[PDB]
Write a protein that binds this DNA or RNA. Sequence first.
RNA 1: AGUUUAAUGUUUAAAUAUUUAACUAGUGAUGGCACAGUUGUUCUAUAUGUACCUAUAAAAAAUAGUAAAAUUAUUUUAAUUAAAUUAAUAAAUAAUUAUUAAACUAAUUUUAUAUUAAUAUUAUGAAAAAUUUUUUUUUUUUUUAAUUUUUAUAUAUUGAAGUAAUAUGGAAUAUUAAAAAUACAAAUUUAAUUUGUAAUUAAUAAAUAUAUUUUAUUUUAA
RNA 2: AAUUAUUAUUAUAAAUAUUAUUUUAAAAAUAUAAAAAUAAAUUAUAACAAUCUAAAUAAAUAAUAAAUUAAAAUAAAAAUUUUAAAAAAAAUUAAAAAAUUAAAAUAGGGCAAGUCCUACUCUCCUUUACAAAGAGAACGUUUAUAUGUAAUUGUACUAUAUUUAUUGAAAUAAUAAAAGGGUUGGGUUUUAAAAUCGUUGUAAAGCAGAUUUGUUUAUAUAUUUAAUUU
RNA 3: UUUUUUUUUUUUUUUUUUUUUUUUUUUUUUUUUU
RNA 4: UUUUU
Lengths: 447, 300, 37, 351
Amino acid sequence: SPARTAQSPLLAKPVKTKVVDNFADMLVTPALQEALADMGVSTPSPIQQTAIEAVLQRKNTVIAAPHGEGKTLAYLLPLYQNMEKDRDVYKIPLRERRPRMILLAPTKELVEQLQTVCARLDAATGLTSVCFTSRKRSKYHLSRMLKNTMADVLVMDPKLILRLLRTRRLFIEDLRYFAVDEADAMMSSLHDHDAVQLLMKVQKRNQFKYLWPVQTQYVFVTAYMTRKLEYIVGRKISDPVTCMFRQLMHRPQARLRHRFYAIRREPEKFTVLMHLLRKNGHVPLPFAEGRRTIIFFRNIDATTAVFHQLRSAGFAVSLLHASLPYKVRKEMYADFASGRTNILCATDVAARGLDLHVDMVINFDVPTNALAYLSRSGRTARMGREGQVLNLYNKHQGVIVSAIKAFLKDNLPMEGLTNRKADMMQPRYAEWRTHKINALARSYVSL
Amino acid sequence: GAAWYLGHMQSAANMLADKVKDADFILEIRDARLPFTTENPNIRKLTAGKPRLIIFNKAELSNEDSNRAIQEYYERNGAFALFTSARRCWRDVVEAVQRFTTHILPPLPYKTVAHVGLVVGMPNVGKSTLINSLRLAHEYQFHREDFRRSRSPETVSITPGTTRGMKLVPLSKDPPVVLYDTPGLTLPGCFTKESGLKLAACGIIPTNDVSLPQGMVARYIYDILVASGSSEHMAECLHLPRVPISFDDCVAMICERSGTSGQTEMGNLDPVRAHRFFVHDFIMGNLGKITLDVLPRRLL
Amino acid sequence: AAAAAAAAAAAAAAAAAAAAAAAAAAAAAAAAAAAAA
Amino acid sequence: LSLQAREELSRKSNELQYHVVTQDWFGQRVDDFVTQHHPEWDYETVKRLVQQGHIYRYRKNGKKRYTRLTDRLEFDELVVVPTASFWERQLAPPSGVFHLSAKTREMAQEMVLFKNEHVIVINKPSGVPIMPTHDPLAMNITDLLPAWRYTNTQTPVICHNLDTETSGCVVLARSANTHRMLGRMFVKRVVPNSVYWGFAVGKPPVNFGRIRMHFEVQKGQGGDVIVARPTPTADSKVGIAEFVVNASALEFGSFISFYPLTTRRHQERIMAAHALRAPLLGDAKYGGESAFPHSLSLFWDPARKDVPLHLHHRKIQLPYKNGAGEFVCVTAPLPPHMEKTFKRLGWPVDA
RNA sequence: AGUUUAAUGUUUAAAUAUUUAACUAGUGAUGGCACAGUUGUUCUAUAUGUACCUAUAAAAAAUAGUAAAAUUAUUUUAAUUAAAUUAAUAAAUAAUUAUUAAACUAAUUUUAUAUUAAUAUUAUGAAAAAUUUUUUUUUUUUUUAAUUUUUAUAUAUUGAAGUAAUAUGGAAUAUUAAAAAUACAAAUUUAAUUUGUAAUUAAUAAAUAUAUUUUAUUUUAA
RNA sequence: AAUUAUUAUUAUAAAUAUUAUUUUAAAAAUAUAAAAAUAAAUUAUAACAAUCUAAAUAAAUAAUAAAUUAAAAUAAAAAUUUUAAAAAAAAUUAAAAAAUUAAAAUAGGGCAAGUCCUACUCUCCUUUACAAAGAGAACGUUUAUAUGUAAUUGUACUAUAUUUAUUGAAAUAAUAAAAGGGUUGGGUUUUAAAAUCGUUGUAAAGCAGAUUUGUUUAUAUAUUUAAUUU
RNA sequence: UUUUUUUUUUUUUUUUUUUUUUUUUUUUUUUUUU
RNA sequence: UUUUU
Ligand SMILES: Nc1ncnc2c1ncn2[C@@H]1O[C@H](COP(=O)(O)OP(=O)(O)OP(=O)(O)O)[C@@H](O)[C@H]1O
């Protein structure tokens, strides 16, 4: 809001809205445009235009977009552009265990995609990237630190980076770039508070003045602007160049269309799902017939209950939650992705920023939040693709769906500083507010 | 400003058709003393093929000669006709709707749905009292709409106004011959000079006012009965020299229960207390048991 | 409501009642084109 | 509106994007930019689009700056100003995208009670319609209209369609710009703005009050009634008038004055035919069947259609004022057919 | 002359009075006796139980934890005035004002500067768009003291046959351009039209048009 | 009945006792009460008459921040305005009117939730219970057991899930509290005993030999007709 | 750890219908607007 | 499923 975010750090300070509208005029090297157009990107999206040269310069940035607006290229592309101008122009030596840039990522299925989208940038020649997740005898899989790594870009979950540090195997000594992805949740107790405690050790090294002055470029990319994200950035980071686009943000996309089903009975939530799963979809490689679809559940106790109920009813349903083993979860993902199995009984793992082909999200329980709803819904329609989200709301989630139903027909920001998830925000509406129970009555009935 | 539907009926036709396009058996409540003034204009071309159950009420005061032809007329067309004295109340008219379908109904495809009945007619000749007698008792003894009979708001107890949409009365249960309402389409108030006479003659539209004084219908019931006899026997019933020469004497001869402030030597009686008498008594079928309409022997 | 166009009264019979509402940057500070008595 | 801004976002059209070059046009007022690039629209046709929102926006940065006509351009942002090219579609683009012999050009000049540079008020003859019903044939006001173009104004526009049988006072606007202004004067008043006179036969209830009926026009000519004290809320609009029985024939007629706060059809006569069931004299459409003229010592020969409806649009308070501070009130004098029954009753016909 | 209502009365003769207004015909009843408050009567009005049904009487504390309201003492001796905001594994301080205390150095006039700790104190409430006038709330008495000028105008002539020219206060010039005015001739479709010349128009180029101090804040002396 | 107060406290007995408290010499409103007209007793009548002074004596009541005012005009403040400012010229006294001043952020429609309401299939602590065990159960009691809603209640390998299944419903027509005046719109308005008690105006201060040099004008219509005269 | 094997989540060697609004036309017409 | 504006 304009008449707000003045009484809030990280803002009241100008938001770089200087559109540059094409890749040439953002000065991205033709060795990177050839690789971009190779991917299929010709025109810069709204977030890209304005924040790619706000990080092509060394300005510490807060990229904030809606959903599927191109943020992953937004921050990553210019950082490869920047790394290339380090190793070649400055000739800053690689060294062994000292990575030029780290990337963070909340979920294991999000880490990996951030690697292949960065792997496709070997046009940024020398840059070699390695991602790492949990495994079996995985502590014996930093062998790829002893081994060839020298990896200028090291994308990993924050917790495993932190252990590589405190046990003296990583050495942020030469950390030139420090990026964070899906920071809305990563910089909070929701994940581990481990994004912080990692800024600082980096923040306390570029102000050490007894090793070379490596001013680490901090880059935060977050679809949601939470109250937590403001202060740990507005109050600690130096000159955060914001890129908020307040007239398209905290809103679900336009071409995405919503459907609200009112369900009175606990066990009736099922037929409404199979009746929804009668859209008969099947693709090459991405007794009953469902389309491309994800089903989001309140809990992994239930995400497998319905999963088996679907499967034993004849669908090719898939299953993805955290308590799965390593082989099954790896497989059960590589079936849904790549054509097979067409429907994915998922929990909130799939809500957190994943890209694929999905085209229909069933909220098997409309979530009690505005993040847990924009994150699920925002997986449906990405970069202009059409898409439908169906909401099986209940009696207990009626209020949130009394308002979601009302904010959509108006296209309003969902309480534009989202809450209830990262900033749990007992202040329903963000200010020194505890809304009144108004009156001017002054009759005060007698007996 | 509580008036009724106001407009020529011949523009309420193409909407009446689509009301018959879904109905099965057409009903009507008429007055046997007015076989074709209490009819909707389309009775001729209204349906011609839906099984009509056309009822003439108050038949005991309508003449019996004209009763035969009007009976066999529709009875030749196939559409039925039933005459009732109304003393034996509509309870027997209801029995008709229990019988006058079992013989003519097409068998229902689904064992218990309805026989959607389209009713028409003037609300003041017997159509209202036929609905609101079966509409009130359905609230207590219950067949459909399936709720606990508590949501009827304050001060209605009946709703023939402002909703009258899908509102319908379930007259019967196992052959559930339900009946519609037909928001009143009759007596348009744009009636004819003469039709208002025959209407207010029968007790229908009993309003006798500046629009229609007694002396205008009384002049009509007297000049209609130019044949003095069995009507002069109502005159002779009150000391009248049998034949009345004209309107002056007969109305003034019957001033025994009439009068106003008149002298002890020259009494100036009141001819309006004699007006209403001669008017309202013919309403009761007391004077003569004779119809008003002409009964076209031709098809029209 | 929105109190616009104040009026600073100087005396009377020497202010002309059109110069009261003058000292406001507008089409006033001119001569009333058609006065009424 | 939120859907109006949607199709605006999802329409290629031709979207004539208009750069704002460094030299000539950066700095100029937008209404100069549109009017010297798009000569097709009249300037008023350009203000409507520029203010309405079916506007020629300007786009510099990531949002659309809808603007007022005086906002000036920016220092070569190549700040495109997008203008609409194929409005026709779901948009529904805005407004602007015989002979009259003498004895008529004179007849239409004795029917003028008031004229200035902004309106013309006439005195309509009871029985001449306004809109044509026999599409080639009937002599109505709209065919007469090129006769009150006094001083060569552009064909005055009719403002409130008086009915056929209604006599009285009409208002034309002499200017399509004045006609927009004279709308707020007619629809759904709160306090009266006009006086209808009439001679209803039959002294109604109390000689002061207000009538609230809820009309419903079922085609053809259903014309329904109070059915809902609140409203049927779907097909019904209410018509409110504050009637005053000025003087009254002792018990058989009255001279009633209606101040029609609303704008409903025959609301004068249908509310008069059910203020008592005493309709207006000669109102064969809604009342009119009591007798032919309701059977009086008036001209009583054909009657069946002789007596014209004694209803007269008497006075209209225009918003244009006068040399003295008073607002102007036309006072269309009664036709002889009401001057007949007024003097036949000896009342002082107030012109 | 016993029975469900209307005016006056308005601290009234009454802490419900006089007249107005709606039906029943004592062989079945004025109190005998009887009932009582987390409940009697109950002709079922959540009406009535001794002039406020929160029944009355007695004893008591949680009962403004509540924009509640009050809170007793002149002549004094230190300052600020809207600032703060992260629910939740290893990241230097909430902020305010307040009470009480603490320390001058790489760091310039030979200038200037309220920093720190401990404790006390967390409710003074914006929704849209647009965007990357001013310093005053508070004075020990005598003087002293620098922010003051009102209004802007324009007519006549002649010829037109319904338009210009001349005079005045922007003026006349000069050329390039056009004269849609226009006037004249000549050619003609008579006349109208064709044609040119000049009034005139516009652009552009050049030379022109009037005067202080003095009434409110910059200090003393006791 | 607070009284020496609106009063025959009447269960009974009764029928020619003059059987012992009511000021004032004026006028209006009001209050009671009153000849005539559009076969009855009625009207309305806000129409004559009739009763209700003053002064003298006696004396209460509510109310009270004070003014230095207060006539009259006229602009200026989130404001609603108590004041202040310019400009005026506003005299005492008694009486009578109530125009203004001293008694609630309301009335009406249109929406949505809530309490009230009914209803149970699933909710919680009911107690009163019933059966069961126990005594060779003529009965008295103490444990173990699910019944009715009885009836009160409440129910919108480091990661990436979890803190809510746990009573369910009804234009529940009226209340309450909110908002509001392509989905969508009907409502328009402001009070019920007033000692006036501040200004106000109206009348007045009782005989003036005498209108009106100049103040100030509730003063108020200019035409609807009829019948003539050219 | 410990560094070896040729890989392995590799082991490993301590809008309306349906089977645009409104302005008080009398079907078809007007006029304003979006 | 499809007619209409
Ligand atoms: N400049 C571009 N032009 C066209 N398509 C693009 C462009 N950049 C990215 N895309 C495509 O659009 C998809 C959606 O954008 P992306 O994957 O970056 O979403 P995201 O930034 O992760 O989403 P979110 O904003 O919700 O976090 C990309 O995965 C890619 O397929």
